[PDB]
């Protein structure tokens, strides 16, 4: 069991709409919940983000897939994002990360 996160890196301008996808793979247990974290340039720590405002999340329990969309990029958005998935069996794991970088 593991979480596949894509893409691994991204380039975009301010005002762009950007999407990150994660899939909970190689497990027979259904997806229960998801979490997203931001690691600011510097990278000594991650902080959990709230799915509100310009941030959207779509969850598809059938494919155990989930997506984070940032609708109108702002300078503070450029950072590294990590998804985390929890199965109904409490299995919990993290995607390898997405570097969101400005063009």
């Amino acid at each position: 069991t593991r979480v596949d996160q894509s893409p691994s890196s991204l380039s975009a301008s301010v005002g762009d709409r950007v999407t990150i996808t994660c899939v909970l793979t190689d497990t027979s247990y259904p997806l229960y919940s998801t979490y997203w974290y931001q690691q600011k340039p510097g990278s000594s720590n991650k902080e959990q983000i709230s799915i509100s405002g310009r941030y959207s999340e779509s969850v598809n329990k059938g494919t155990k897939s989930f997506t984070l969309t940032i609708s109108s990029l702002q300078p503070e958005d450029f950072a590294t994002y990590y998804c985390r998935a929890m199965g109904t069996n409490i299995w919990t794991g993290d995607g390898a990360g997405t570097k969101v970088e400005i063009k």
């Binding site: 229960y32 000594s44 720590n45 929890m86 109904t88 409490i90 919990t92």
Partner: protein
């Protein structure tokens, strides 16, 4: 690509060789030191080629195929070598037993040891690994590498001391005691993972880590629990190289994420690999957040109690365990598990009724008699030995009167250990007594359950061997 190449480069030659020696010693416990050394060297040799050329022949084979093939060379009975992977490894696991006992080790005199430690330190430390590994086949391998380092340090200092023995022996006896206990806990973990699966181990770990990291979010604790479970599954299945590699990765992850985990990790994370891990595993509980709500809101009054329980039992019961344990570092883990069991049983019953809330509204009242049962049974025996003295005898009388079907000299060995429980744990304040007392006690009883399983003589003790109710089982018997 090459699994051996990967681990060799991840672990480094010195740790690679050591872990391989342990793997071999834990499977082939009766083979002389000199045999293992050869196999190890051969295997290490092979690994070095794969590192240089990952395409080389046989470099794409699984670790169990490679090592299993090496072990099956040496001219305790084994039809395991007649089998192919993965069956073979499974057969090796089944024949691993801490029961087959070799004579006790007789230490040479200190002057001779120190001399050997000087003439060839590598072999001297190798012999240590070999000797512990073969006598304790379930010993947590990456932790044994740290014992070795502590062993080496004890000889590095004490060998120059005025009274070498006065310096050294207490260090070697302490190391021995910690090794016996470490080995006992791990054996318990392996039993549960091997018999039941992950569920019991993960409940214990959610409880334990929530006490230790009270400020971490539930998802963070959960992520740590998943990693820890993977580490221990590999170790218990004889994937020692993977086990050690993942443990190191877990230590690195924890150190990089201190802010989401605990404020008490700063020091641990500056230390070198082997002791960094040991340190993290021994770190003391952080302080809980100041203004936590009662548990009633989320677990009794919430309209989603039954819905949460139905949709993801393990998650909900895990959140209960987490929220409870983080508020109660003074409780033992087994107590926390009995409460979670009680709560689960109540939901399974009530969430079927027309008005569930009516049914489980007083569920927390059920917890009262549970929290008190260990609080007294400890207070009483702790006071009973605050007026009796260490020199153990009274416990010998009672426990033997319970089950006299077991060997006599073995029963005395247990009583001696029991006396060591109240020896140190009663010294600490009340809000730290249950943790060290009731948990260690439950481990001592596993040492009892396994030893008796080899030579069955009683039907009452074997019945005890639920890991949570193992105490109330033997503690109540008259």
């Amino acid at each position: 690509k090459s699994e051996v190449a990967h681990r060799f480069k991840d672990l480094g030659e010195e740790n690679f060789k050591a872990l391989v020696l342990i793997a071999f010693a834990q499977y082939l416990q009766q083979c002389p030191f000199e045999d293992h050394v050869k196999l190890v060297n051969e295997v290490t040799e092979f690994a070095k080629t794969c590192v240089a050329d990952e395409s080389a022949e046989n470099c794409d084979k699984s670790l169990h195929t490679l090592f299993g093939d090496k072990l099956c060379t040496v001219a305790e009975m084994a039809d395991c070598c007649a089998k192919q992977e993965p069956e073979r490894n499974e057969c090796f696991l089944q024949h691993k037993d801490d029961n087959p006992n070799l004579p006790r080790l007789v230490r040479p005199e200190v002057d001779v040891m120190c001399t050997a430690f000087h003439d060839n330190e590598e072999t001297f430390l190798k012999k240590y690994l070999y000797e512990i590994a073969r006598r304790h086949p379930y010993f947590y391998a990456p932790e044994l590498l740290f014992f070795a380092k502590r062993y080496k340090a004890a000889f590095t200092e004490c060998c120059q001391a005025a009274d070498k023995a006065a310096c050294l022996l207490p260090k070697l006896d302490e190391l021995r005691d910690e090794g016996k206990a470490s080995s006992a806990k791990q054996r318990l973990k392996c039993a549960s993972l091997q018999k039941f699966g992950e569920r019991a181990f993960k409940a214990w770990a959610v409880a334990r880590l929530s006490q230790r990291f009270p400020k971490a979010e539930f998802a963070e604790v959960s992520k740590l629990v998943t990693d820890l479970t993977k580490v221990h599954t590999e170790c218990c299945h004889g994937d020692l190289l993977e086990c050690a590699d993942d443990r190191a990765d877990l230590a690195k992850y924890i150190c990089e994420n201190q802010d989401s985990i605990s404020s008490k990790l700063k020091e641990c994370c500056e230390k070198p690999l082997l002791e960094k891990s040991h340190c993290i595993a021994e770190v003391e509980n952080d302080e809980m957040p100041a203004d936590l709500p009662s548990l009633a809101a989320d677990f009794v009054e919430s309209k989603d109690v039954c819905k949460n329980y139905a949709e993801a039992k393990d998650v909900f019961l895990g959140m209960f365990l987490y929220e409870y344990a983080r508020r109660h570092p003074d409780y033992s883990v087994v107590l926390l598990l009995r409460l979670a069991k009680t709560y689960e049983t109540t939901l399974e019953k009530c969430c079927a009724a027309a008005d569930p809330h009516e049914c489980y509204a007083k569920v927390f009242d059920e917890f009262k008699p549970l929290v008190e049962e260990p609080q007294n049974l400890i207070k009483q025996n702790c006071e009973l030995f605050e007026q009796l003295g260490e020199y153990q005898n009274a416990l010998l009388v009672r426990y033997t009167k319970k089950v006299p079907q077991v060997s006599t000299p073995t029963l005395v060995e247990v009583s001696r250990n029991l006396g060591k429980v109240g020896s140190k744990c009663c010294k600490h304040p009340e809000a730290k007594r249950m943790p060290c007392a009731e948990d260690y006690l439950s481990v001592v009883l596993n040492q009892l359950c396994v030893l008796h399983e080899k030579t069955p003589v009683s039907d009452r003790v074997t019945k005890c061997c639920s890991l949570v109710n193992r105490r109330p089982c033997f503690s109540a018997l008259e």
